[PDB]
Amino acid sequence: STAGKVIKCKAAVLWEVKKPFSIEDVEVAPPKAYEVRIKMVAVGICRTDDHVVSGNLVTPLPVILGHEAAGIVESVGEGVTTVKPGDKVIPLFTPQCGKCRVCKNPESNYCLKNDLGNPRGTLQDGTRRFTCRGKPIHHFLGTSTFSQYTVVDENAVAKIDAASPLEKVCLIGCGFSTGYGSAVNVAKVTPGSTCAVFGLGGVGLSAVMGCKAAGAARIIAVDINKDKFAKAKELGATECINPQDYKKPIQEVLKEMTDGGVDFSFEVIGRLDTMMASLLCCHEACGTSVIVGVPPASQNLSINPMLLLTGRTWKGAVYGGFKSKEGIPKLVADFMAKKFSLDALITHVLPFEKINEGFDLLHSGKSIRTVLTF
Amino acid sequence: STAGKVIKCKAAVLWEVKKPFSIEDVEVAPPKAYEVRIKMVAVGICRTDDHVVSGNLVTPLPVILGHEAAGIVESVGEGVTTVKPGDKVIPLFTPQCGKCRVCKNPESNYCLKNDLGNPRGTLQDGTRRFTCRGKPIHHFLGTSTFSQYTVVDENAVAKIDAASPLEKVCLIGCGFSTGYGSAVNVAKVTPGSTCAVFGLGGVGLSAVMGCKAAGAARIIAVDINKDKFAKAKELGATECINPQDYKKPIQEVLKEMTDGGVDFSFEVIGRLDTMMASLLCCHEACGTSVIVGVPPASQNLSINPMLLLTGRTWKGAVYGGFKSKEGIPKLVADFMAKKFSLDALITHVLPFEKINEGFDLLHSGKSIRTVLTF
Ligand SMILES: [N]C(=O)C1=[C][N+]([C]2O[C]([C]OP(=O)([O-])OP([O])(=O)O[C][C]3O[C](N4[C]=NC5=C4N=[C]N=C5[N])[C]([O])[C]3[O])[C]([O])[C]2[O])=[C][C]=C1N1=[C]C(I)=[C][N]1
Ligand SMILES: NC(=O)c1ccc[n+]([C@@H]2O[C@H](COP(=O)([O-])OP(=O)(O)OC[C@H]3O[C@@H](n4cnc5c(N)ncnc54)[C@H](O)[C@@H]3O)[C@@H](O)[C@H]2O)c1
Ligand SMILES: [Cl-]
Ligand SMILES: [Zn+2]
Ligand SMILES: [Zn+2]
Ligand SMILES: [Zn+2]
Ligand SMILES: [Zn+2]
């Protein structure tokens, strides 16, 4: 019925920054060659989506955000070999074209086909598939999952287990993968090591889970919102610190707690002051600091190079180091194999139409993750 | 015989910053427990020594500098078990106490008994062994080799091959180990990779050799002194470029020549602008920039954290990641086995008394490594 036909549906369109989303009628064009048109089922709210709402992450507007989600293949374009209609899928905010220098490198995952470096708000072919009131609307990270239907490039979609509960598994689309992989793939936490995690939201907590799985002996959870400590400990944090209870700077408080500093620290928030704190609290001779939080546009850090000369390793990564099209699937399988659980991360489930309410909860600090359902 | 007695000898004293070295008679107190008094045979002139003179590295004056050396054990204090009088040895600017958190950690080498963090200008017990006209003289990195005799802690001296040519293996005491290990140990250069080395002094040329040993496919040597190019080439560089020949920033050139950037970048000069260019020239998603150059005191770098989120790795190291006491002897054995040659690095040989002429050669850019004989 719908195949090859333009689908009219509802989607949350952002026309301006610091404005609410508009649940409007938009026309979703049919998938071109090597493209897949997905029917969304569950979409989780990531702070990155909010970054555009706040102006911290610039991207052409009007836009349809969303990138953390799960859905079903409504139809595919010509040349599509990986997914067929009906297949359960997870759109990847970072592609794996498999042909660029990066994709060919065994330890890189930031494919050259991404729309993060220099945002165009289009699909890999430079064009858009969304329209609304005679106006073309921009995509976001080539996923735009805040819509009942969306078109994505084949190399940016991954087929998952047919029995996968799309309402939970949508987190593996971003939050869980990013945090967990940051600990296991990027930092490469060693068994018996000491770790520190700044920020305890959806991504932060999965970093706790990742350090735990890696065998970290001590995991120090850091957050100004005390309410997150309950979950942090439950997921594996050995202790919880709130920077506000101290008269002393956090990195100092941390170094005196761990005999000179932690082995691995992760900044999962997105502030310069906290990224400075994470670099400073990891032992000057053998510590590794992993930046996970997305920094506000055009801001810099002033660092003394002596901080690295002694032996510190400072790195960062997108998507927790997982090569998208391969990693996400295998992750779902592990979830199926009951290797881990995403239940503690989902605190609120709202109907798509109340997306604006979902962003409110994120700003009030009442929710870890909120899953908008279709 | 001089054991147990105060030795009187010549040493090069720096009384004030930015002033020539003054060759004076000093008294060298005999060694205490776990200390070794050494008779110097050959010393190399490293830019770090010059960093104190110029004022870029702060350390208490007046002082006896020098740290890349080779000599013979004159006598040992009570408790010493790792060396005996007559042994050929290399003092280590960074000790390997073997009992601290860092020494236990198999991946870090920056021992806690170092005098680089906050220089006391003493031995490990907190005292000095040099006197000059009543005035006690400060030590440097616990080694102070610009003297005919010096005393070092036992954990800062490595016993080497009895047949080692001391006028050659002194480079292994610092310059070579640092350069070669930065590539092989710290960056862990992968075979078939592309490398950029900024700075072609004795340390930077050892970084080049190390990249070649690692099997890099390309090694681009950068330096504003074209007279260094002939040696870089001979040592492994596939190409050499002079930033002054270009219209655009060196980082943009390097990225254009290597399909987006190198895989491994090395800053071996000690300047802020080059450490930045060095980070910027390694591929945003898979590059590793390694800081080897000692930056001028209290100077800060201003960086956009986004530069790291894409996948870049930024780190630094001392002594090229080698655990001093263990690594030096092994490296001397490799030298003995012809595994590598030091001849190209050693461009000048002058008697100790001509030390000022040696620093002048460095300043003019006419030398790579100048060795001083006693
Ligand atoms: N880390 C460690 O361990 C170390 C370090 N360090 C450092 O390094 C550097 C360098 O050294 P050297 O090699 O000796 O020096 P020289 O000879 O002077 O060389 C330099 C080079 O560079 C070049 N440049 C300049 N500028 C520039 C350039 N290029 C380009 N661009 C620019 N701008 C010149 O020409 C020459 O050639 C320094 O910094 C030092 O410091 C060393 C060693 C080691 N250590 C540490 C220690 I406490 C002691 N030692
Ligand atoms: N690299 C990536 O792949 C990637 C992926 C997804 C998200 N992110 C980024 O990760 C970061 C967090 O994502 P999330 O969705 O889990 O966010 P979130 O907003 O729900 O959680 C941020 C947490 O940090 C805490 N916090 C805020 N200011 C703090 C401070 N100054 N000190 C200590 N804690 C503070 C908040 O209480 C909250 O618990 C954001 O920057 C997001 O853009 C990065
Ligand atoms: Cl268009
Ligand atoms: Zn790719
Ligand atoms: Zn996300
Ligand atoms: Zn040196
Ligand atoms: Zn030690």
Side-chain angles (χ1 to χ4, degrees):
Chain A
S1 312
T2 47
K5 298 288 298 178
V6 170
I7 294 188
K8 197 179 78 168
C9 58
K10 255 69 183 63
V13 187
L14 181 68
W15 304 90
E16 289 182 29
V17 172
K18 296 170 186 176
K19 235 82 179 188
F21 295 89
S22 298
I23 304 301
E24 306 203 15
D25 283 292
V26 295
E27 304 84 42
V28 182
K32 290 187 185 177
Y34 307 109
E35 302 185 5
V36 179
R37 192 153 74 165
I38 304 174
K39 164 64 179 63
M40 232 54 60
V41 182
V43 174
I45 298 183
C46 193
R47 174 65 68 169
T48 313
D49 293 307
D50 183 61
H51 287 329
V52 181
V53 179
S54 48
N56 280 302
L57 192 65
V58 194
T59 204
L61 301 192
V63 72
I64 288 176
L65 298 177
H67 59 270
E68 177 176 280
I72 308 146
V73 180
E74 180 274 323
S75 68
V76 294
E78 339 234 55
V80 174
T81 303
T82 60
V83 300
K84 264 59 199 302
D87 270 343
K88 266 176 183 177
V89 291
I90 292 184
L92 318 165
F93 72 86
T94 307
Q96 183 175 350
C97 86
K99 69 86 185 66
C100 72
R101 176 186 176 171
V102 180
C103 289
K104 299 190 220 201
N105 194 304
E107 43 268 308
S108 322
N109 69 330
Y110 184 63
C111 175
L112 306 192
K113 243 63 180 63
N114 73 82
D115 199 52
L116 170 63
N118 186 211
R120 303 193 291 175
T122 65
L123 281 185
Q124 298 171 26
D125 73 332
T127 55
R128 292 156 297 183
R129 305 283 165 279
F130 300 126
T131 39
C132 180
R133 294 117 116 297
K135 282 172 170 299
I137 306 309
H138 291 89
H139 294 240
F140 180 57
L141 299 192
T143 57
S144 309
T145 61
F146 283 160
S147 190
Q148 289 166 340
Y149 289 93
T150 194
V151 190
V152 180
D153 284 287
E154 184 182 31
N155 62 30
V157 179
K159 171 189 154 184
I160 61 172
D161 188 273
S164 303
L166 313 182
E167 302 67 40
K168 297 173 197 288
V169 118
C170 56
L171 276 60
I172 291 180
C174 184
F176 184 79
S177 296
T178 300
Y180 187 85
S182 288
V184 185
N185 299 326
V186 193
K188 284 196 174 66
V189 169
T190 51
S193 63
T194 288
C195 309
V197 188
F198 293 80
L200 298 177
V203 186
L205 296 178
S206 308
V208 180
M209 295 187 92
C211 299
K212 215 289 229 61
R218 190 164 170 201
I219 306 173
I220 309 172
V222 186
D223 208 302
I224 56 169
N225 177 342
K226 306 170 58 65
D227 298 311
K228 305 301 179 76
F229 300 154
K231 288 296 180 67
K233 293 189 180 70
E234 174 183 332
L235 303 180
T238 56
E239 47 222 287
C240 301
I241 302 311
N242 177 339
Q244 283 184 97
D245 301 336
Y246 299 82
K247 278 184 169 61
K248 179 142 53 190
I250 196 63
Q251 67 276 15
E252 294 305 309
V253 174
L254 276 161
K255 289 163 53 183
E256 298 175 9
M257 225 184 286
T258 50
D259 296 313
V262 310
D263 298 298
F264 305 90
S265 44
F266 305 80
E267 197 276 352
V268 209
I269 302 166
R271 329 214 311 144
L272 297 187
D273 61 293
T274 41
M275 286 170 189
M276 254 285 86
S278 330
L279 180 57
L280 294 175
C281 73
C282 70
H283 196 289
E284 76 185 343
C286 53
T288 295
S289 194
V290 182
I291 301 178
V292 185
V294 178
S298 301
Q299 288 177 51
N300 292 170
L301 285 179
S302 293
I303 79 134
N304 182 305
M306 273 298 318
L307 295 175
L308 302 180
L309 191 66
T310 45
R312 273 190 182 106
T313 298
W314 200 10
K315 50 171 52 189
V318 169
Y319 231 152
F322 287 110
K323 279 195 175 283
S324 54
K325 210 174 169 59
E326 299 175 341
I328 277 64
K330 294 165 188 172
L331 280 178
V332 182
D334 289 348
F335 177 73
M336 295 281 103
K338 315 208 95 304
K339 249 73 167 185
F340 61 89
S341 183
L342 301 174
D343 290 289
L345 309 178
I346 308 160
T347 59
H348 299 53
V349 183
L350 291 184
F352 174 69
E353 13 283 316
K354 259 184 289 190
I355 175 175
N356 284 300
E357 187 179 281
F359 275 64
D360 272 326
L361 294 165
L362 182 70
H363 305 161
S364 55
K366 292 188 177 66
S367 59
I368 300 298
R369 270 303 202 271
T370 285
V371 175
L372 293 170
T373 194
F374 297 79
Chain B
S1 171
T2 40
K5 313 175 183 68
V6 164
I7 293 180
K8 198 184 175 67
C9 60
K10 297 278 180 177
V13 191
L14 183 67
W15 296 98
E16 216 162 278
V17 161
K18 239 151 295 192
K19 296 283 184 182
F21 284 92
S22 173
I23 279 54
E24 308 200 7
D25 297 278
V26 293
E27 291 73 59
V28 192
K32 292 183 188 176
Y34 312 104
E35 305 193 340
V36 178
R37 185 158 70 196
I38 308 179
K39 176 169 184 303
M40 229 52 52
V41 174
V43 171
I45 296 174
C46 175
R47 176 70 61 172
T48 305
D49 297 307
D50 187 57
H51 278 337
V52 181
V53 179
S54 70
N56 290 152
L57 180 63
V58 304
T59 199
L61 276 59
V63 61
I64 293 181
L65 300 177
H67 61 287
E68 176 174 294
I72 301 175
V73 175
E74 176 266 342
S75 69
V76 294
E78 332 135 40
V80 177
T81 62
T82 58
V83 291
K84 69 188 179 193
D87 284 349
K88 282 182 179 182
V89 291
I90 291 183
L92 318 156
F93 73 89
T94 293
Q96 187 179 351
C97 87
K99 308 155 182 177
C100 73
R101 173 180 174 177
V102 178
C103 283
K104 238 81 68 64
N105 188 321
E107 299 309 302
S108 44
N109 68 336
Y110 187 58
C111 180
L112 302 178
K113 303 295 198 302
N114 72 83
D115 203 51
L116 179 66
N118 294 110
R120 290 195 287 170
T122 60
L123 279 187
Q124 281 166 41
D125 72 344
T127 53
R128 290 155 293 191
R129 305 274 171 281
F130 302 126
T131 302
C132 184
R133 305 185 290 209
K135 288 161 288 186
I137 307 289
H138 293 103
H139 291 239
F140 178 55
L141 303 182
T143 66
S144 300
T145 57
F146 285 161
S147 172
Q148 278 168 0
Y149 287 82
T150 197
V151 175
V152 310
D153 291 87
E154 191 190 12
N155 62 32
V157 56
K159 173 193 162 66
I160 66 167
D161 198 275
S164 310
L166 305 180
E167 334 76 57
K168 296 213 184 308
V169 296
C170 50
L171 291 216
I172 287 176
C174 177
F176 182 75
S177 299
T178 303
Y180 181 95
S182 290
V184 164
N185 292 148
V186 191
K188 293 191 170 185
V189 174
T190 51
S193 61
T194 290
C195 299
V197 180
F198 290 75
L200 305 176
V203 177
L205 286 172
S206 304
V208 166
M209 291 173 70
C211 289
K212 184 182 181 182
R218 287 182 80 181
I219 307 164
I220 309 174
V222 188
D223 200 300
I224 60 172
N225 189 346
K226 54 185 287 177
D227 294 334
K228 296 291 184 82
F229 296 171
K231 202 79 66 142
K233 240 74 193 306
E234 179 194 335
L235 293 179
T238 52
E239 50 220 294
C240 304
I241 67 191
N242 189 331
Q244 299 170 131
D245 292 334
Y246 300 83
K247 235 83 161 191
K248 55 177 60 175
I250 190 59
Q251 58 267 33
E252 291 315 306
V253 169
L254 277 157
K255 294 205 303 168
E256 277 175 8
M257 302 171 44
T258 60
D259 181 42
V262 302
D263 297 297
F264 301 100
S265 224
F266 298 86
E267 199 280 355
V268 205
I269 301 166
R271 288 169 51 99
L272 285 194
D273 61 327
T274 50
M275 294 185 183
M276 182 70 270
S278 193
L279 175 67
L280 296 175
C281 84
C282 64
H283 199 267
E284 68 169 1
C286 53
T288 289
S289 202
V290 177
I291 291 178
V292 181
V294 173
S298 299
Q299 249 69 288
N300 283 151
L301 270 175
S302 189
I303 51 87
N304 188 319
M306 274 295 318
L307 294 171
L308 304 181
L309 202 67
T310 52
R312 270 183 182 106
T313 289
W314 206 15
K315 50 162 58 157
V318 171
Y319 236 155
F322 286 118
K323 288 185 172 292
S324 65
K325 202 173 175 73
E326 287 177 25
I328 297 298
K330 140 276 196 311
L331 226 30
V332 170
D334 287 4
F335 171 81
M336 293 282 84
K338 312 289 184 175
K339 194 147 300 85
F340 63 81
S341 187
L342 295 177
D343 278 86
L345 305 171
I346 305 179
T347 54
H348 305 252
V349 188
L350 299 174
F352 170 62
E353 319 88 67
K354 281 181 180 184
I355 189 169
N356 287 299
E357 195 179 314
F359 281 72
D360 274 331
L361 290 171
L362 183 71
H363 301 139
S364 54
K366 274 299 177 300
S367 52
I368 292 174
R369 265 315 197 248
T370 293
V371 170
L372 304 173
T373 58
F374 290 67

